[PDB]
Design a protein around this ligand. Sequence first.
Ligand SMILES: CCCCCCCCCCCCCCCC(=O)O
Ligand SMILES: [Cl-]
Length: 133
Amino acid sequence: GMSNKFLGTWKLVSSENFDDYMKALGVGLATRKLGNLAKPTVIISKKGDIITIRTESTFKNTEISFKLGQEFEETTADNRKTKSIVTLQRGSLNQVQRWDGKETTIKRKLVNGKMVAECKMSGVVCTRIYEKV
Ligand SMILES: CCCCCCCCCCCCCCCC(=O)O
Ligand SMILES: [Cl-]
């Protein structure tokens, strides 16, 4: 299933077009000002068939535990309450979030030993790169 190369503790090192992505989610300015300044660290772990993705930052922390391909309630860092699913496509980890008839996706794939996360919303595209510790 999911590559054990994902398991570990990743540190963000680059964000591209994050603001426009947050605006597309309806995030207020003042909140964005801190989001753009944030440098989260992501911890991915598994217990059996359950995967957990934790996000730690000075501003907000998050955590989702899920089985692949099974819908699950999620609370995003901007406090959206979504019905999310995580799929596996060509070794990429694709998280979708549905709420209020709106929809966003966060695709996570490994590239040359780095985790790359693409966030798409209303045509906007974010690209955040993480480095293993
Ligand atoms: C995780 C930092 C929180 C920033 C402040 C909340 C506003 C943004 C909420 C949605 C961001 C989702 C992007 C996740 C991308 C990643 O894997 O780093
Ligand atoms: Cl931080």
